[PDB]
Amino acid sequence: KKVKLIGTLDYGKYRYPKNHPLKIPRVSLLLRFKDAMNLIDEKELIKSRPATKEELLLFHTEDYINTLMEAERCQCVPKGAREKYNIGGYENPVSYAMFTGSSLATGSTVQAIEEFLKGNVAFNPAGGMHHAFKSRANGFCYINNPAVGIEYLRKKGFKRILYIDLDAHHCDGVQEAFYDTDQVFVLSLHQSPEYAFPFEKGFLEEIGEGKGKGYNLNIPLPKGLNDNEFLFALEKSLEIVKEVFEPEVYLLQLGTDPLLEDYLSKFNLSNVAFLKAFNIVREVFGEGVYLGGGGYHPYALARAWTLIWCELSGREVPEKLNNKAKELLKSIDFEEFDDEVDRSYMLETLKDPWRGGEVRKEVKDTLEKAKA
Template sequence: MKPVFIGSEIYRGSSYGAAHPLHIPRVSTVMDMVRALGWLGPGQYRTSPRAKPVALTGFHTPDYIAALERAEAAQAVDEVAFKRHALGTTANPVFPEMFRRPATGAGGVMLAAQLVAEGGVVHVPGGGTHHAMADRANGFCYLNDPVLCLLALRRLGLSRIAYVDIDAHHADGVEAALGADDDMLLISVHEENRWPYTGKLTDTGGGRSTNLPVPRGFNDTEMGHVLHRLILPLLAQFDPQAVVLQCGSDAILEDPLSRLALSNNAHAEVALALRDLSQRFVVLGGGGYNPWSVARCWTRVWGALNGHGAGAELPAPAQDILAALTWNRRGPAWQVQPHWASTLNDPPRPGPVRPELADRVAYLRKRAGLARAVHLAPSIARA
């Protein structure tokens, strides 16, 4: 069965506000790109349903869901919603679709779980909001759709479910919800000393959680080291029945909310490697605050999952989509680069595997009792 792409028109024109990092278009650009490239065959696109409030209370508290609905309807929050539920803050502002948009992402990931029940691959770029807590918004995230996806997979009767998160920020909401559960393996690779300042190397979440804080400048070679020396061996040891990848693009060099240095080659390589480890594979979006890098990354991941190469120059319709994007960032670090509109693949960003990273991986391998690495096919970046 061909991979399935889940999207929605709710993302088109929906924004957290002009001053917020999520004022940029993301999912709608990916939808436009995959169509312009001819990468959606018959039956591959599904419109995301909007999750009903009762479905959301499978994780979130009824009081919180009610407060979120009221805030959208009134376009304002009361003191309880602000103080107890963190709604109407700078990070989690009031905006017109503040309930419907995250509820659509949640509906998409729960549909993804159903679609992979008998095996398959599903990409939900509108998912990946991994910071939300059961009773409050957190870190731009109103609902925790990764948790809702994992719980939906559990309801299918699966007893070994793996969650891998390569977003630049620690998956604190997922770990708080499911980190102590024996049927879940949670792996988070994130920048050290970066908000939310959780996910220390020694943290286990009370269960199988593996946290790898990585240093600034984390490069493609180092991600390859982490993938083959840690992530794949941990998954092989756990033997998951389903794998969920949170594929946040904010670890890419040009993203303004991290100081990591990956290319999108790393994301494509991780996605393909994880896909080959389980018959049920769900890929979510996540962070990503440069409109070109996030759109190119998630489009490229979808292409890789469908066997499409990314090295050639994009056709004119796809280039036009990327050329039309705008950004309010100023300064030399954020100037638009020619390849942002001409091709999907970033230049590879290799580098040394620094001793501090190698030592952290070795510590986690020893803690998990891993004896050997797992080596798969060559990197997609070299294909």
């Protein structure tokens, strides 16, 4: 069984614009970072390929896909598309990430699935664009690779597919996509919509509809979440899923936004708890298909996914970053949101110290209601 990382430095040329949180390098940064740390070899890397039109149409509608292609190459917001497809605003702007970069991340998810089906283990850090809808952009996402991937598996004959989303934001796009079926089960832990995007979905009472009622489980969590609370919630929710669903295969999305250093979440987790969460899922369901996700702090993203790569790859995690790696991170013009918190300590070690605490009653209550 080989372990593979799907990626390419080309993502670096399809960055979001200016002000946008996705302006920073991410998968290209991960690749350069693992290379600088000498934690990856050429034969472990599979070059990302674009999703084909056919693969895209496994989930998205033609008119929507055609609009993304036209908007991108002509660099415009076609008449009626802002309203109809949610394209053009600050959130889902016109850029080359809208179709080319998105198609590359999505093809990489199909590649990750292809590798898994060959019996190998793969990680597509560019994947996990979980907010896009069948025919509309949303939450910085234009193409929903998790949904394309799940439909890819359904076409292959899988009838029990589990999707687990550990990103700090709700996979509203994925929820809608499989809300109606009992063939797919979606579990998402995320900041409560009472205070975080998408605000409109992500509540605990959304458990599906029709045949799929009972096959969607949202675990909304509070501000200031610590490591113990996140892992408590994870272990308990996995038990709920396990008692009701026996997956033939599962996909796991690993956005790094739940970390303390990422301002896009009110969660204050450590990279080490992030790593334990990943391993807890594997202990419960064995090996699955691994995807990236939201993560908007370059240092946080790089070190955390590096822990994931080291776990999968079977190599020891160095306790410190070498010079090439620190200089790489320092070269990223990022600018911390808070004028000065000082995140330079992140350059001094790969793993951060645990960030635990007591498990609040709120969290215990949510999981108890989720069970019933």
